[PDB]
């Protein structure tokens, strides 16, 4: 039972961690994209003189 | 008759000596099996936060 244990199981700290890195970098990537998604804005500028 | 109780018959003295370590084993047992029970909760406290 101990060797299934050391097998299947998984550690709780390391799932937690690369849960909460996973999230942030989720956020961080929306952030972004809504960024980039704001940058073409310019072209109206460019076009209204 | 005395051949036969130095054979079959016990010696009381080991026996109670037995009997009370036996005790205090099985209640050492329990206590430390209630803490080992008690161990795992911190991952409940890692996934709280």
């Given at each position: ?5 050391r ?5 709780y ?8 890195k996973?999230?942030?970098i989720q ?6 994209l ?5 940058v073409?804005?310019q ?6 003189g």
């Amino acid at each position: 039972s101990e060797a299934q244990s050391r097998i299947q199981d998984a550690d709780y700290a390391t799932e937690v961690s690369n849960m909460s890195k996973a999230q942030i970098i989720q956020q961080a990537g929306n952030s972004v994209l809504a960024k980039a998604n704001q940058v073409p804005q310019q072209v109206l500028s460019l076009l209204q003189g």
